[PDB]
């Protein structure tokens with residue numbers, strides 16, 4: 175039987191739940207009878223990614239929409255869906271493509287998680303909790319609730335919840351200090367770049383088995399670069415609620431996980447509208463999408479030499495922007511060093 179601290183044990187049970195993966199799949203209206211969890215393929219997902227990029231290129235230069243309809247039917251044949259008696263959405267426009275690309279990101283992560291769960295070795299004497307914990311190849315420690323780390327993290331959550339995101343409020347249940355096997359060596363080349371910031375990354379619970387195993391990754395090459403507002407990079411927020419929205423929490427499942435990462439942003443390429451790129455212009459290290467609302471720079475503090483923008487929301491002074499809140503994008507996985515993992519209770523305002 176396991177000796178892990180009991181918060182870490184609940185975390186492991188949460189990350190490796192197959193039923194949550196099946197529920198995520200049912201929430202995308204995927205047909206679980208024709209295409210169950212065990213018949214999820216990495217290469218099938220990549221082929222779906224290629225269909226999305228074919229729709230992107232077709233729409234972009236005046237192809238038949240005959241063509242685009244055929245590609246949408248091919249997509250629904252490659253990934254079987256259960257829509258009952260409604261008509262499935264058509265892949266004819268940019269929003270359809272973006273929805274399916276986010277969906278495929280989560281599908282790929284689910285495949286990674288199930289591949290982890292059913293792989294490696296199994297040892298009947300050992301607690302499954304211990305087996306999965308060491309499958310994560312991460313050091314997970316509980317952060318003391320009265321530390322100053324915890325002070326700053328609670329203040330970061332408390333101060334940067336946007337008013338637009340009025341469907342819920344957040345309660346911090348546990349704060350974990352994580353260390354990914356190998357990540358600090360990979361991050362070393364970027365640890366004295368200027369402008370390193372502690373930023374949020376939310377994702378579904380089922381995805382953290384992937385995120386803790388392999389880190390935060392960039393979409394595969396088959397993924398359409400126009401399926402993401404600022405192209406194929408790793409996306410962070412400085413508003414806790416903007417990232418928390420990407421946990422895809424629900425009333426039926428109100429606990430989520432969110433990441434705090436040291437991001438070496440360096441020279442930020444400032445953008446107010448979508449720009450589907452895979453590389454930065456020479457001399458830039460990150461993209462910053464400017465919101466009309468920013469955390470107050472007055473109130474930034476430092477934690478292990480990293481800036482924390484835990485100020486309250488004020489106007490940026492940016493006028494012709496299409497973003498309500500900031501976004502930070504990096505295009506090299508080495509530019510990220512994950513520091514903390516947070517268990518959040520979503521209290522839905524009903």
Ligand SMILES: C[C@]12CCCN1CC1=NNC(=O)c3cc(F)cc4[nH]c2c1c34
Pocket residue numbers: 276279374375376377402403409410411412416417418420500501502
């Ligand atoms: C839809 C998108 C774009 C590429 C994959 N994505 C998933 C995501 N996850 N998590 C975040 O915390 C996040 C925070 C942001 F400020 C902007 C973001 N844009 C994304 C995310 C995101």
